[model samples]
Target: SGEISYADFEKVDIRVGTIVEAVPFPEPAIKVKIDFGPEIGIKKSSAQITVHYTPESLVGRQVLGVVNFPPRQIGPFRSEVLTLGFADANGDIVLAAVERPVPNGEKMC
Candidate 1:
């Protein structure tokens, strides 16, 4: 039930990026400005992270993201990347990060 075919998994293009900015908004969630370095530049993701993180607390951290997904919209915002995470016991979001920092724009092989 928790498995995906290797072919299907390849469809997900994940990359590493740094949090250049994190804007917390109640209506739209956390507007994360990620710098995927020059290769991918910056992308925005409206993430719901109020339960575990604040804008100030998240900025300047490296994170993994799904970049191949189509743009997602909420109200007036268009998130370019899918900032990846998991649900905690309470269903609150928890970001997935690397054990150590990696270069931005580096694809997950």
Candidate 2:
């Protein structure tokens, strides 16, 4: 992987959010809506995470997202944030989140 300049990293607006909604799709994708406080409001994201989580399990969960990118269309959803995740042994999605609860909208890493 190539290295990113400190300035380039600053361009990424990574913030913490609370899950507002989550839904499953036949495409095996999960649609997520998260609240990142007043400044950022709520945004939607599309992810293939059916193997790891469910809608009810997702709501009220906190996550970090890259909110600066342009919205993208996937299937029947408009994705706004890049809800962070990692792959498992089988390349299944494992959500990126923290143990401690932080504020709704804050500059986080």
TM-score for each prediction? 0.89, 0.91
Query: Candidate 1 on 39-100: residue-level lDDT in tens?
Result: 78899987888888889899998988988888878778888998889999999999999999
> How displaced is residue 97 in candidate 2, in Å?
0.5
- Best-performing candidate as measured by TM-score: 2
lDDT of each: 0.88, 0.88
For residues 51-105, what per-residue lDDT tens digits would candidate 2 score against the true structure?
9899999999998889999987775578899999899999999988988999988
Model 1: lDDT equals 0.88
Candidate 1 residue 53 Cα shift, in angstroms, is 0.3
Itemize residue pairs with steric clashes in candidate 1: none
**Where does the lowest 10-residue lDDT sum fall in candidate 1?**
21-30
| Local lDDT at 86 for model 2 | 96
Judged by whole-model lDDT over C-alpha atoms, candidate 2 comes out at: 0.88
